[PDB]
Amino acid sequence: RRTKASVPAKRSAFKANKFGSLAPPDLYPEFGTYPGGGESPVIPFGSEKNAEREIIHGRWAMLGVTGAWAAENGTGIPWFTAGTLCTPDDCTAVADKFPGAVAPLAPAGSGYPNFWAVLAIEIFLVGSAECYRTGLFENPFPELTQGDVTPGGRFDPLGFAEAGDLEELKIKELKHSRLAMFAWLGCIMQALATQEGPIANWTAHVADPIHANVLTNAAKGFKFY
Amino acid sequence: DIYPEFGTYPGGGESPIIPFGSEKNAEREVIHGRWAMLGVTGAWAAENGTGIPWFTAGTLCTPDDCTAVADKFPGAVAPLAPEGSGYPSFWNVLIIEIVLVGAAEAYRTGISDSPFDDGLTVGDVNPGGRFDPLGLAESGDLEELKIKELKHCRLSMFAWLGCIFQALATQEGPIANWQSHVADPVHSNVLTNAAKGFGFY
Amino acid sequence: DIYPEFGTYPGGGESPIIPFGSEKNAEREVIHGRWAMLGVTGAWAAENGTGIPWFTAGTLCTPDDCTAVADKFPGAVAPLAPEGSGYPSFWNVLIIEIVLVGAAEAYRTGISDSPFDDGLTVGDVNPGGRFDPLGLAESGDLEELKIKELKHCRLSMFAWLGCIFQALATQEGPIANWQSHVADPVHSNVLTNAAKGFGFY
Amino acid sequence: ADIYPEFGTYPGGGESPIIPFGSEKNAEREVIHGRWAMLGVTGAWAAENGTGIPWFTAGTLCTPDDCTAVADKFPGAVAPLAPEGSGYPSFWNVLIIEIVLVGAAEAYRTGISDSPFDDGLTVGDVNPGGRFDPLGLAESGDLEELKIKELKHCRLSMFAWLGCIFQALATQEGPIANWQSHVADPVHSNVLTNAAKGFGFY
Ligand code: CLA
Ligand code: CLA
Ligand code: CLA
Numbered sequence: 048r049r050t051k052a053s054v055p056a057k058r059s060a061f062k063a064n065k066f067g068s069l070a071p072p073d074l075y076p077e078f079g080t081y082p083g084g085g086e087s088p089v090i091p092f093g094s095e096k097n098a099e100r101e102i103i104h105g106r107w108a109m110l111g112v113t114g115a116w117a118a119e120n121g122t123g124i125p126w127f128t129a130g131t132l133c134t135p136d137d138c139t140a141v142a143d144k145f146p147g148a149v150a151p152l153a154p155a156g157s158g159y160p161n162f163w164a165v166l167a168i169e170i171f172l173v174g175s176a177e178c179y180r181t182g183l184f185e186n187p188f189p190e191l192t193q194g195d196v197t198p199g200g201r202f203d204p205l206g207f208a209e210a211g212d213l214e215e216l217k218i219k220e221l222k223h224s225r226l227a228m229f230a231w232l233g234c235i236m237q238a239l240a241t242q243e244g245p246i247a248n249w250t251a252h253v254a255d256p257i258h259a260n261v262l263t264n265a266a267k268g269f270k271f272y
Numbered sequence: 273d274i275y276p277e278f279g280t281y282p283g284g285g286e287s288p289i290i291p292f293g294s295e296k297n298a299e300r301e302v303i304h305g306r307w308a309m310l311g312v313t314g315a316w317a318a319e320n321g322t323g324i325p326w327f328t329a330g331t332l333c334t335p336d337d338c339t340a341v342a343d344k345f346p347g348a349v350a351p352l353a354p355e356g357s358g359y360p361s362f363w364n365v366l367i368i369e370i371v372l373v374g375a376a377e378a379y380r381t382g383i384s385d386s387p388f389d390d391g392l393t394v395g396d397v398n399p400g401g402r403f404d405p406l407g408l409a410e411s412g413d414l415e416e417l418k419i420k421e422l423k424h425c426r427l428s429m430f431a432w433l434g435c436i437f438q439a440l441a442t443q444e445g446p447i448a449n450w451q452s453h454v455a456d457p458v459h460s461n462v463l464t465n466a467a468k469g470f471g472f473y
Numbered sequence: 474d475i476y477p478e479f480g481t482y483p484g485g486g487e488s489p490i491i492p493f494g495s496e497k498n499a500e501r502e503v504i505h506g507r508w509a510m511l512g513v514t515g516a517w518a519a520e521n522g523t524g525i526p527w528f529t530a531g532t533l534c535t536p537d538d539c540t541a542v543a544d545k546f547p548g549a550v551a552p553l554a555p556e557g558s559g560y561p562s563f564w565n566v567l568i569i570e571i572v573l574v575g576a577a578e579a580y581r582t583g584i585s586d587s588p589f590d591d592g593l594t595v596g597d598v599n600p601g602g603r604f605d606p607l608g609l610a611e612s613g614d615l616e617e618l619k620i621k622e623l624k625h626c627r628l629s630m631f632a633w634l635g636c637i638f639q640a641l642a643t644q645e646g647p648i649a650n651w652q653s654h655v656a657d658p659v660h661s662n663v664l665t666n667a668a669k670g671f672g673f674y
Numbered sequence: 675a676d677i678y679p680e681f682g683t684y685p686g687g688g689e690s691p692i693i694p695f696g697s698e699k700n701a702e703r704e705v706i707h708g709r710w711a712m713l714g715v716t717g718a719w720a721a722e723n724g725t726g727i728p729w730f731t732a733g734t735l736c737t738p739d740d741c742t743a744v745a746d747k748f749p750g751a752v753a754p755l756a757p758e759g760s761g762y763p764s765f766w767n768v769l770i771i772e773i774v775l776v777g778a779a780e781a782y783r784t785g786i787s788d789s790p791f792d793d794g795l796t797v798g799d800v801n802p803g804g805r806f807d808p809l810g811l812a813e814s815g816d817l818e819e820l821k822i823k824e825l826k827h828c829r830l831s832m833f834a835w836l837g838c839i840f841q842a843l844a845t846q847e848g849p850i851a852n853w854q855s856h857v858a859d860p861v862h863s864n865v866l867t868n869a870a871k872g873f874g875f876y
C-alpha cells in the first residue's frame with residue numbers, strides 16, 4: 048500500500064442548477080413570524096433552542112402526517128391502530144402493507160419481520176442518527192455542525208439550498224412544518240373524537256360537507272355522550 | 273386594599289404564578305373576561321328561563337331546522353319567526369352573525385378602519401369614547417371601576433371554566449348543578465360525583 | 474458533575490425547556506416534590522397494606538360513614554375507633570384536618586407569626602434550624618443532600634403524574650398495575666392497554 | 675422574475691421567449707380576456723354543480739320560442755325568476771335588455787361613447803381604480819404584486835376555458851362530469867383513455 052491521493056473530480060448524480068427564490072420578497076405574510084425575524088405573536092419565545100425544536104418536530108410531523116396519509120390510502124388501516132399489527136407476537140401481518148410491493152417484508156411462511164428484530168434495528172439505526180444529529184455520540188461529519196437543523200452538505204445531494212435562495216427555502220420549510228404539526232394535532236384529535244382514520248374523516252367530510260363535521264359528531268357526543 | 277385577593281392587576285406588581293410577559297396579555301385578559309361574562313350570563317339565563325343546557329344549545333339550531341330556537345324566549349310577546357318554519361334558518365342566522373361579528377372585531381382591532389370615526393383607538397380595550405353613553409366612567413372612579421371590571425373578568429372566566437368541566441363531568445348543566453348542590457350540599461358535590469365516576473368509571 | 478441527568482438544579486443551570494422565571498417557581502417546585510413524595514409513598518403503602526387504590530380512598534370516609542378507616546391499618550393492636558362506637562367521623566377528622574394543616578401552613582409561609590419565634594425565616598424551603606433535630610443538615614455535605622432531595626422530589630412527582638394517568642387509564646391502581654406489568658411485561662404495557670382500549674375504545 | 679415564477683412572463687416584466695410582447699393593446703386584451711375567462715370558467719363550474727347541465731348545452735335551454743327552462747335553474751332560489759304561473763324571461767327579453775346593458779358597459783369601458791360618470795375614469799386602462807374597486811383593495815394591498823396576481827389568475831383561467839372547450843369537443847360530457855370521472859379513477863379516466871376509445875369519433 049502506497050498513498051495515491053489522486054483527484055476524485057466527481058460531480059453529483061443530480062446537482063440542482065441555480066434556480067433562486069420562487070417566492071415573493073415578503074416571506075411570512077401569515078399569522079406570526081419566523082424565528083429571528085420578528086416578535087412571537089402569542090406564545091413567548093422559550094429559548095434559542097426552541098427554533099430548532101420547532102424545526103425537528105415539524106420535519107418529524109411532516110413525515111408522520113405523510114405516513115398516516117399514505118398508509119390509509121394504500122391499506123385503509125388507521126395510523127393509530129397500525130401499531131397493533133407488528134407486535135412481539137404476530138408481526139408477520141405488518142409485512143404486506145405497501146401497495147404494489149414487488150415482494151413482502153415477510154416472504155410467505157415463517158419468513159417475517161419480527162417485532163424484536165424490527166425494534167432492535169430501529170433502535171440501532173434511529174437512535175444512532177438521533178444522537179449523531181445532536182451533541183450525543185460524536186460528529187462523524189466534521190464538515191457539518193451538530194445542533195444545526197440545516198447542515199446542508201451531504202444532506203442536500205441535489206443542492207436545492209444553494210441552487211435557490213436559502214432563507215426563503217428555510218421559511219418555506221418552516222411554514223410546511225407548522226402546517227403539518229397542526230394537521231398532526233388535528234389528526235390525533237380526530238382519532239380521539241371519531242375513532243376513525245384521517246382519510247376516513249376526510250372522505251366523510253367531503254362526501255356530505257354540510258354534515259360530518261366537529262359539531263355533527265358533537266351532536267352525538269363524539270361517541271361518549 | 274385595591275386587590276386584597278390573590279394576585280394583582282397588570283399595574284399592581286409582579287404576577288405570582290405566570291410571568292406577565294407581553295403587554296398585550298392584559299388586553300387579551302380583558303376581552304376574554306368580557307366574553308366570559310357574556311357567556312356565563314347567557315348560560316345561566318337560558319338555563320333558568322328555558323331549562324336547556326347551554327352546551328346542547330348548539331344542536332338545537334342546525335341547517336336541517338332552526339325553528340326550535342324561535343319562540344323559546346321567556347315572556348316573548350313577539351314571535352321570533354312567522355308561523356312559517358321555513359323563514360327562520362340556521363344559515364340565515366349564521367351569515368348575519370358572521371358579517372356583524374367580523375365587522376365588530378375588525379373595527380375593534382384595526383384590520384379595517386373605524387366607521388365610528390371617533391377617538392376610540394385600536395389595539396385598546398374599553399376606549400370609552402362612545403361605548404359609555406352615560407358618563408359614570410369619568411364621573412365615578414374610573415380606576416376603581418376598571419379593577420372591578422377585571423375582578424369580574426377573572427371571576428366570570430374561572431366560572432366558565434368550571435361550567436365547561438361540569439358539563440364534561442355532570443352533563444346536566446351549570447345552573448342544574450347549582451340546584452343539585454343546594455338541594456343536597458353534602459351528597460352532591462365533586463367528590464360524590466367522582467365516587468359515581470362522572471358517568472365513565 | 475453533581476447533576477449528570479438531563480436537567481440541572483435551580484442554583485445553576487438554564488432550565489432548558491421552560492424558562493426559570495420567578496424564584497417563587499423554584500420554591501413551589503420543591504414544595505410540590507416534598508408533598509408528592511409523601512403522596513406516592515402513601516399510595517404505595519395503602520395499596521400494599523389494604524389493597525385499596527388511593528384515588529378511591531376518599532369514598533371510604535364520607536359524612537355518613539368514616540368508620541371503615543379504623544380496621545384498615547395493618548397490624549394495629551386495637552382499632553382506630555372506640556370499636557363499635559366509631560367516634561372518628563368524616564367531619565370529626567375534617568375539623569381536625571383544617572385546623573392542623575392551616576396552622577402548619579400559615580406558620581410555614583408566614584401568614585401568621587411563627588410560634589417558635591426562634592430566628593426561623595418564613596419563605597425558605599430548607600429552614601435547617603429546628604426541623605433537623607438529628608443534625609444531618611448540619612453534618613455532611615448539605616448542598617449534596619439538597620441535590621438528592623431535589624432528585625427524589627422530581628422523580629416522585631413524575632411518578633405521581635404516572636400514577637394519576639394510570640388510574641385514569643387502567644382503573645386498577647398503581648401497585649396493581651406494577652404487579653400486572655411484572656407478572657408479564659411483554660403483554661401488559663401502556664401500548665397493550667391502548668390496543669385493548671383504556672375502557673373507552 | 676422573483677414574483678412571477680410561471681413558465682412565461684408578464685408584459686413589462688420582460689420579454690417572452692415565444693411570441694414576445696408587441697403592442698400594449700395586446701396586454702390590455704390579455705387582461706380583459708382573462709377577466710371574462712375567470713367569469714366564464716366560474717360559471718361553467720358553478721352552473722353544472724347547481725343543476726348538472728354542461729355549459730355548452732346550457733345555451734339551447736333558452737330559445738326565441740321557449741325560455742321557461744332557464745327560469746328556476748338557480749339552486750336555493752326562494753321563488754321563480756319570473757312568475758311561476760307564466761315565466762317571462764324570453765330569449766328576446768333577455769336579448770333586448772342584455773344587448774343594451776352590455777353594449778353600454780362595453781362602449782363606456784372603452785370610451786367610444788361619452789362616459790356617464792366622468793369621475794376621472796380613464797378608458798383603455800385595465801385597472802380603472804375608481805368605482806370598480808370600492809373596497810379599494812389595491813390601496814391597502816401592494817399594487818404591483820396584485821397586478822401579478824391578476825395576470826396569473828387571467829392566464830390560468832383562460833387556459834382552463836381552453837380546456838373546457840376542448841373537453842367539450844372531445845368527450846362532450848361536461849367539465850365537472852369530466853372532473854368526477856377523473857377523480858373516480860384517473861388511471862383509467864384521462865385524455866389518453868378517451869383517445870383509446872377514440873374521442874367519440876374514431
Ligand atoms: C386572448 C388571450 C391572450 C392574449 C391577448 C395574450 C397576449 C399576450 N400574452 Mg398571454 N397568455 C394567454 C392568453 C393570452 N395572451 C394564455 C391562455 C396563457 C397561458 C398559456 C398565456 C401565457 C402568457 C405568457 C406565459 C406570456 C404571455 C405573453 C403575452 C404577450 C405576448 C404577445 C402575444 O402572444 O400576443 C398574441 C396573443 C396570443 C394569445 C398568441 C396567440 C396564440 C395562438 C393563436 C395559439 C392559440 C390557439 C387557440 C387557443 C386555438 C383555439 C381553437 C378553438 C377555438 C377551437 C401578450 C400581451 C408574454 C409576455 O407578455 O411577455 C412579456 C408571456 O411571457 N402570455
Ligand atoms: C412542539 C412544536 C412547536 C415548537 C417547539 C414551537 C416553537 C416555536 N414556535 Mg411554533 N408552531 C407550532 C408548534 C411549535 N412551535 C404549531 C403547531 C404552529 C401552528 C399552529 C406553530 C406556529 C407558529 C407561529 C405562527 C409562530 C411560532 C413561533 C414559535 C417560536 C416561539 C414560541 C415558543 O418558544 O414557545 C413554544 C411553546 C409551546 C409550543 C407551548 C404551547 C403549548 C400549547 C398548549 C399546545 C399543545 C399542543 C397539544 C394541545 C398537546 C396535546 C397533548 C396530547 C396528550 C393530547 C418557537 C420557535 C413564533 C416565532 O417564531 O416567534 C418569532 C411564531 O411567530 N410557531
Ligand atoms: C385567557 C385568559 C387570560 C389571559 C389572557 C390572562 C392574562 C393575564 N393574567 Mg389573568 N386570569 C385569568 C385568565 C387569563 N389571564 C383567569 C381565569 C383568572 C382567575 C383564575 C386570572 C387571574 C389573574 C390574576 C390573579 C393575575 C392574572 C395576571 C395575568 C397576567 C399574567 C400573564 C399571564 O397570565 O400569561 C398569559 C396566560 C397564560 C400563559 C395562561 C396559560 C394557561 C394556564 C397555564 C392554565 C389554564 C388552564 C386552561 C384554562 C385549561 C383549558 C382546558 C380546556 C380547553 C379543556 C396577564 C395580563 C397577573 C397579573 O396581572 O400580573 C401583573 C395576576 O396577578 N390573572
Ligand code: CLA
Binds near residue numbers: 480483484499501
Ligand atoms: C409543579 C411542580 C414543579 C414546579 C413548580 C417546577 C418548577 C421548576 N423546575 Mg421542576 N420538575 C417537575 C415539576 C415542577 N418543576 C417535575 C415533575 C419534573 C420531572 C420531569 C421536574 C424536573 C425538573 C428538571 C430536570 C429541571 C426542573 C427545573 C425547574 C425550574 C424551571 C421551570 C419553571 O420555572 O417553570 C415551572 C413551570 C411549570 C411547573 C409548569 C409546567 C407545565 C407543564 C404543562 C406540566 C405538565 C404536566 C401536567 C401536571 C399534566 C397535567 C395533568 C392533569 C391533567 C391531571 C423551576 C424552578 C429546571 C431548573 O431548575 O433549571 C435550573 C431543571 O433543570 N425541574
Ligand SMILES: CC1=C[C@H](O)CC(C)(C)[C@H]1/C=C/C(C)=C/C=C/C(C)=C/C=C/C=C(C)/C=C/C=C(\C)CCC1=C(C)C[C@H](O)CC1(C)C
Binds near residue numbers: 683692713728732
Ligand atoms: C359561463 C358560461 C356558462 C354557460 O352555461 C355557457 C356560456 C358559453 C355562455 C359560458 C360563457 C363563458 C365566457 C363568456 C367565456 C369567455 C372566455 C374567454 C374570454 C376566453 C379566452 C380564452 C383565451 C385563450 C384560450 C388563449 C389562448 C392562448 C394561448 C394558449 C397562448 C399562449 C402563449 C402566449 C400568449 C405567449 C407565451 O409566451 C407562451 C404561449 C405560447 C403559451
